[model samples]
Target: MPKPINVRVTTMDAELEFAIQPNTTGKQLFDQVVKTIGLREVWYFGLHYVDNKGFPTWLKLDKKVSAQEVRKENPLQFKFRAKFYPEDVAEELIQDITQKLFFLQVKEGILSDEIYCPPETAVLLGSYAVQAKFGDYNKEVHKSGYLSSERLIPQRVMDQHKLTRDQWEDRIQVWHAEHRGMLKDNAMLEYLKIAQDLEMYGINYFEIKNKKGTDLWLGVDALGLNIYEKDDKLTPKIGFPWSEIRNISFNDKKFVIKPIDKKAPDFVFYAPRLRINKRILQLCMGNHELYMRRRKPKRITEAEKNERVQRQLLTLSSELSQARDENKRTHNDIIHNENMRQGRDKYKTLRQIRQGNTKQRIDEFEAL
Candidate 1:
């Protein structure tokens, strides 16, 4: 029998502290919190109120409550309760809650889809946590930090493995089916593989090129890889955004790649070459521009701003449609490969059966 899991629940506003077994349902926990700390008036009441003046003799009523009255009597207060489970919660439940929080935050106007971190970040964080725990010894020596820097099999090398594109596609399909929609992006997987290879080789620079032939250097470090383009001068240093290059322009002649000042291990391996497709470049640039626009807003009317938001949404929807189409095409290619494999297996089985009959016939003829 397993021991019951203990959870500690804490509230910030109410200075409430309580404990419950892990068996307690979320609803039960929430109800317990609400019971301990009375729900704020705003949770139950609305803005509209009727004022009863003097008795039935004279009564003046306003359909809407005064701002002052609302502020004083119907003031908004929110209670935040956190539950710390003794053991790690199931990943599916964590994902469900994360998605729920994401939608709720969006609906509450606290976050926008454009403003949110990319889904890949969440995946990377989870992977990092798992790896850190699994490789505890390496972590003690700071070796685990190089997990992202591990060497990846070069594309040219991978191609030589005689894994036909179809075979790779089938592998990816099988992986996705087993992982329940976790491994959806082939490109991301490819990039992660390269990152791992770079880490293993202790190589910092993994060269990536945009569709326009612009070169970008991805350097792996303890924190993660720093991605930036090398300057024309061929200096080993790369300039981060906050570093030397506060302002950047493509046309600027002084635009040069600066190397990192910190000393790093010198393990030379041929930089893995990556060619970014045009669509990916467009998506990245568009996302960057949207982020910049949101951070520094130009004065615009509410209606015009909303129109802009709609346009952005349409663009993103188109991008998502294209991604889905690409995924579907890959899936179909995998299915075709599977069909071929099945056909081959069927042919092999039939041949074996026929050979067995032929041997029996030969034996009978010899006996005769």
Candidate 2:
């Protein structure tokens, strides 16, 4: 009898455990977790595990649990995260559960400095999160150091900036009060709306070396790819939107980005010790698809335009034929009416003559 391995998967707000056969694949585990959460839109999420490189890499769904790279833990640990972020959360994310998971995961990411939000933006996002959790901020209940227990801002962000705990709390409390009766769900959505605009939000980062032998972080998002220096992640050294990218191809560890311009040279980077080049390409392809899907397809637009014009032409032709028929009917009616009046006058004159009224008319019409 094969022993069933214990597996533990951690979600945004819950931890799930599964006892499965040693031969159980990642897909089985993923499906079970998704089923438990009642999540229908499964494409946006994936199971991630800490690889041997200590990098958070996606769990290959096709591979067996024993075959994949997993840390030596009793119950293998894995994290559930959003693999693809929508261009518009409010428009794209339809499920409340999906949105809630996104909210929770993003909030956790911000706290961990994985998303890399600025101090100003961090404070605002923290306030919305607090409001979502605690509702309206009451000074009576929320005393000093109320926020100290809460892991709102990352310690890295705190260490870099010179702000006391009181100052940060005061700022967060002021913004928290400004939310003013916002519901829990609304606050969460509102937090996403603000966070999505940040440069680091929804970015999947990979450490690579540039052509000049400088270490940099390459980030991929729905919009495009960006290059960030080793130390400064908040700002991008340069970014390439999907429109600017002509092609992307990788030869082993060396990845290349070709720009659309003829004069501009291609940017080449090497992903040293990273076997995930194929994974990067896969992610980029999906991201590009999502990016392009949002835009209206030009071929469909042209088809729609031609159809609209054809419909109008059909309407105009039908209206013209109806008008022509009405004109012909009116013309025939005028001629018929004119002929009937003439016939009536002739009858009256003939009757007067037959009645011997000619002599009386001649007598009465002496002058004219």
Candidate 3:
């Protein structure tokens, strides 16, 4: 029998260690981590690992760990990260823990220079992050050099400009004061709301080549697929929303994307390796599936709305039947009253005729 493989999956809050058989699927490992952490909102997260090709890839949960092309090292290491971002984080992410994870990961991403932020925006976000970490800022506790050791701005931004840490902290302090008594959760949510507007937010970028040998970054996110120029990662050169995409498939290193419009030709890009192409295809399919789902009505709410409509219809039908019965009773009462009135008139006319005959007979007797 094959020995069990040890896996170490690192999450935002904690690093989870697991030992499982070689045949264990990615889904199994993912479930283990989720179960261990008691995470209810699972769809927004995924296990990621850098492949031997030096490209970051999401683990194929459907396939066995041994079958997938993960880096071959003892005690396999995987980083669990937020894979999908809800358009409305406050409403979509229900659990507190889920929100916390998203907050931590996004903060790390910005500081690590993975998710790019403009210099001005970075300072504002950094302030919120500081508030989240240290609570309501106290002037006594948080002085001029409070953020000196803190890494807030992205390294690139720091290197590009020669602003000292004190300068950055001064700017951040101004914003941090704005959040007077905000709690950690509120501050984190504010951070995410501002970060959501960034062009690079929640984008999974993959470096690939277009048909003309021009280098580009293929970004897959909740919205759809975007193609960004090599240097201009901020603006997308070509964008294909999930609604416009009809199908996606891979052939070795070549990836094909067919558009919904029959007139438009299929778009093709080339990845570095077949493994990269496979990962791209998987990400595309998953993103498209989520896109389609979000477009549709929610399962529970849809059912509840239908049920409410049915209940209303039933109530209206019962009221209509009650009104019909009341109308019938009212008609019968009117007819009975009319019949009684006619009978009384007929009896009075008969009595008058009898009196007239009696008077005539009396007059005839008197004349005789």
Candidate 4:
């Protein structure tokens, strides 16, 4: 008989344990735990356990026991809780989830196009997905040490989302199936690859045709336009940032933009509109203005107004802390004079004698 490993499962409101066979998969264990605890939306819940490195790793459902190492030093404890919920879960029964769990959902939501999480969370999550798409240290094929183009990622950055190696592999497999062929290697191409994968990546605009007037679906967004070879996602794509744009002008059926970069050439487009759609022009124009607005008034010695306010808040908070601690807690605390200890002690004898006399007089009158 195979002995089961006891895994402790905890939620924000409750905790429980489940014994699983050593060979059981993460999904199996998670499903069983959720069922036992009467948890709904089991797919939204995942199991996370701290790895041997003491860093937390989310357990994937498709992963089996032999595929992973056991952390025997710490007893097997798994957190089984909601990993994803749409925004406004207040009306929904699921009331609590950790930030880590929330992060996983954001990633899942980005890939699937049904994110209900905070918008900023989805942006950060998409970046991690890009990390998985491109292996850090940039390339596996090393030419020479001196000429090595392998972009090395720092340790601090690798754990920001704390995605597991297996998780990256799993996501890449999906990306390969959908996009086909190897992932983008060039920095610019990879940027486009990740951009397309993000939810709310940007506002959609009319697809501008290329030099040969064939890339009818080259997407434009808030920052820049995607120069694509074809109208599909599988086509080769490149991103041009707005800061590099020199001037934008359009004719009856062509849109043009000169590049600030001496090396990069001017961009010409053939789309449905003169220049571009009025809406896309507005979208790109508004974002560009905002971006430009942020840089105009840069001063070498800018006052730290927000920082000063923060410092004042800290001092005020300390004052409030002292005021709160004054009542019966410490010597230096503000005294509660209305309920003075010294005054109460001084009146104790007189108040007791007066009460005794009044009670005795009332008792004698009643007796008579």
In angstroms, how far off is 183's CA in candidate 3? 2.2
Which 10 consecutive residues of model 4 have the lowest summed lDDT?
297-306
Superposed model 1: Cα runs more than 4 Å off:
1-158, 164-166, 181-236, 243-252, 255-368
Off by over 4 Å in 3: 50-56, 66-74, 140-145, 159-163, 298-368
Per-residue C-alpha lDDT of model 1 across residues 195-232, encoded as one tens digit per residue? 22111122224455433445655443211223343441
What's the number of clashes in each of the models?
Answer: 19, 0, 0, 0
Model 1 error, position 60 (Å): 60
Model 3 whole-model lDDT (C-alpha atoms): 0.70
The candidate, 3 or 4, that scores higher on TM-score is 3
**CA shift at 191, candidate 2, in angstroms?**
1.1
CA lDDT of 72 in candidate 2? 60
By lDDT, highest first, what's the ranking? 3, 2, 4, 1
Candidate 3, residue 141: the lDDT equals 84
lDDT string, candidate 2, 101-158, tens digits: 9999888888886766544456667878999889988889988788887887876546
lDDT of 3 by residue, 1-368 (tens): 99899889998979888788889999998899999988988988899997776777788889998777788788888998888888556557787788889999888888886776645456667878888888988999887788778887776555544456676678677667767788898888777766665656788789887656667788887767766667655555455668778889988778878877776667677888776677678778878887788787511211133463235334433433322323233332343334346642222322332242322422322222
- 113 Cα displacement, candidate 1 (Å): 29
| C-alpha positional error of residue 326 in candidate 1 after TM-score superposition, expressed in Å | 31
How accurate locally is residue 254 in candidate 3, as Cα lDDT from 0 to 100? Answer: 82
Instruction: Please give the RMSD to the true structure for each candidate, in Å.
Output: 28.8, 31.0, 30.8, 32.1
